[PDB]
Design a binder for this molecule. Structure first.
Ligand code: 72R
Length: 209
């Protein structure tokens, strides 16, 4: 059972802007996704302070970076609070309608694309490098779901039947054919050290066979 939804008009505009605007500093996508994971890990930690039973689905608060050259995917896994089905349909837990407005206003008022995270819509920077994005998420209060979109104005949501996650979010980036540099160990390391050296959770960069 696959449900197809249409993006809000403002969100579809944001995605086509990111896809079509000539902009060479694409590496900032990893900083935004890692920052989104750190925000989700902060949320589960804060709720765990007043209720330790919320960590029953997983006590480790970490971030893993998993490149795969065979599938040409870069996956960002975190054990954060996760997202419900309502969260997924509601623009992946963001206030994307108002955040897109302030972002597009700034883009004509001097700002550039690298400042996308300052308006809460940093997740969509994934389409700077990915032709398709798959999001697997598991919140304590809901089941495991799979969000997917190749842009084009629509996305799909389905119950995920694959490997159970416990709790957290998995962002799979199906990279464009000319963006395979972000599958290289030294390139990923350089970006993490440059843009995410002070993240308060362990970041493990997986290596390949
Ligand atoms: O990619 C990276 N992960 C890391 C974790 C710890 C650290 F000190 C550096 C790095 C990287 O560059």
């Amino acid at each position: 059972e696959v449900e197809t939804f249409a993006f809000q008009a403002e969100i579809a505009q944001l995605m086509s802007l990111i896809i079509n605007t000539f902009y060479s500093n694409k590496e900032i996508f990893l900083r935004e996704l890692i920052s989104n994971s750190s925000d989700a890990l902060d949320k589960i930690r804060y709720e765990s302070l007043t209720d330790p039973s919320k960590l029953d689905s997983g006590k480790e608060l970490h971030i893993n970076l998993i490149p795969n050259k065979q599938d040409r995917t870069l996956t960002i896994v975190d054990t954060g609070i996760g997202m419900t089905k309502a969260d997924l349909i509601n623009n992946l837990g963001t206030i994307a309608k108002s955040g897109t407005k302030a972002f597009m206003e700034a883009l004509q008022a001097g700002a550039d694309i690298s400042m996308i995270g300052q308006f809460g819509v940093g997740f969509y920077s994934a389409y700077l490098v990915a032709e398709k994005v798959t999001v697997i998420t598991k919140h304590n209060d809901d089941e495991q779901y799979a969000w997917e979109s190749s842009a084009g104005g629509s996305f799909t949501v389905r119950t995920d039947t694959g490997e159970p996650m416990g709790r957290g979010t998995k962002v799979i980036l199906h990279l464009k054919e000319d963006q395979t540099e972000y599958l290289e160990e030294r390139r990923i390391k350089e970006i993490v050290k440059k843009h995410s050296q002070f993240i308060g959770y362990p970041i493990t960069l997986f290596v390949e066979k």
